[PDB]
Amino acid sequence: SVGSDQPCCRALYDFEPENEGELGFKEGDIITLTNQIDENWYEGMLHGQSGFFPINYVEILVALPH
Ligand SMILES: [Cl-]
């Protein structure tokens, strides 16, 4: 398995993608966190796909480095 120290977050709400760069998900999904683009958007992965999603839609479980 990937290490338990892999940055990740829990979706608190559904997010449906409205462009082809966004990573959609459903409430409760555990998203692999890969980057923070700005004060509003993360990048991450779920089920092998990658894309952007709102910081405000998730609960951090393991934070990216600061
Ligand atoms: Cl620290």
Give the distance (Å) from ligand 1 centre to CA of residue 14. 30
Technique used to solve these coordinates: X-ray
Domain holding 27, by residue range, is: 1-66
Sequence-distant (6+) residues with CB within 8 A of 9 are: 30, 31, 33, 42, 44, 58, 59, 60, 61
Is residue 23 classed as helix, strand or coil in its secondary structure? coil
- In the chain, how many domains are there? 1
CATH number for the domain including 12? Answer: 2.30.30.40
Q: Which helix (H) or strand (E) holds 9?
A: strand 8-11
**Can you give the resolution of this entry in Å?**
1.4
Give the distance (Å) from ligand 1 centre to CA of residue 54. 23
Give the distance (Å) from ligand 1 centre to CA of residue 16. 33
Give the distance (Å) from ligand 1 centre to CA of residue 63. 10
Ramachandran bin of 47, using left for φ above 0, alpha for ψ from -120 to 50, beta for the remaining angles: left
* Alpha carbon distances (Å) from 3 to 8, 36, 45, 49, 59: 11, 20, 15, 19, 19
